[PDB]
Amino acid sequence: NWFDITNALWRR
């Protein structure tokens, strides 16, 4: 889901 990408990014 495109809408989940910023989360994975934020957890980095």
Partner: antibody, heavy 127, light 109 residues
């Protein structure tokens, strides 16, 4: 506190192209998803697509594919919507919207939903 | 291509009453990623609920959201004068995000 300011109303001839800007201030620009949503007079909302500035990863709705282009200028915290081959049916108020963050502040975990919206830009396509 | 159906289109109530708005998805919504927006005429939408039941800071506590799967609901314990507007649901459980057609909450007199 995130504020999105958009460019002014535009009048375009059928077949032309239009570019709408959205300037953001507050919070982090490059790490949050910025989408464009439109609304024809008297109709409902319709998500068109968005972009993740940092990764430049775009996502467009199928009915706009190959006619739409969304980009982001991280130097200016400005996002852009470019819609080509304009038709009268494209007449609408276009809004940019950034996803919100959990809890207070604007740096927490993203939430996907659109917490921040621009004032909107009326785009009239007619001859 | 998830389709969200909000019914009824119009709800006729009054200040002080409880309102219940439903949104049905043509297929299950991933991770319950459904949001609700309030929109007043000529104004930009305002986020009320996200994740189906989460309410951001700044949103009146009278707004509540529940549900999961294909059936979601927006509840307003008691209506205030400014709450009469159009409410829209949105699913972002797939890259192709979509909005419901909206439900109008008007004042019955």
């Amino acid at each position: 506190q995130v504020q999105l300011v958009q460019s002014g109303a535009e009048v375009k001839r059928p077949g032309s192209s239009v570019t709408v800007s959205c300037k953001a201030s507050g919070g982090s620009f490059s790490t949050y998803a910025l989408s464009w949503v439109r609304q024809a007079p008297g109709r409902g909302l319709e998500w068109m697509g968005g972009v993740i500035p940092l990764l430049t990863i775009t996502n467009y709705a199928p009915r706009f594919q190959g006619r739409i282009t969304i980009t982001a200028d991280r130097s200016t915290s400005t996002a852009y919507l470019e819609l080509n081959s304009l038709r009268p049916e494209d007449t609408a108020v276009y809004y940019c919207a950034r996803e919100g963050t959990t809890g207070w502040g604007w740096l927490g975990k993203p939430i996907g939903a659109f917490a921040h919206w621009g004032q909107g830009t009326l785009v009239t396509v007619s001859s | 291509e998830i389709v969200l159906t909000q019914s009824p289109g119009t709800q006729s109530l009054s200040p002080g009453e409880r309102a219940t708005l439903s949104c049905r998805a043509s297929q299950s919504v991933g991770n319950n990623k459904l949001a609700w927006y309030q929109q007043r005429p000529g104004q930009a939408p305002r986020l009320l609920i996200y994740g189906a039941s989460s309410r951001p800071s700044g949103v009146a506590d009278r707004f509540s959201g529940s549900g999961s799967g294909t059936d979601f609901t927006l509840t307003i314990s008691r209506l205030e004068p400014e709450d009469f507007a159009v409410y829209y649901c949105q699913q972002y459980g797939q890259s192709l995000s979509t909005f419901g057609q909206g439900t109008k909450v008007e004042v019955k007199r």
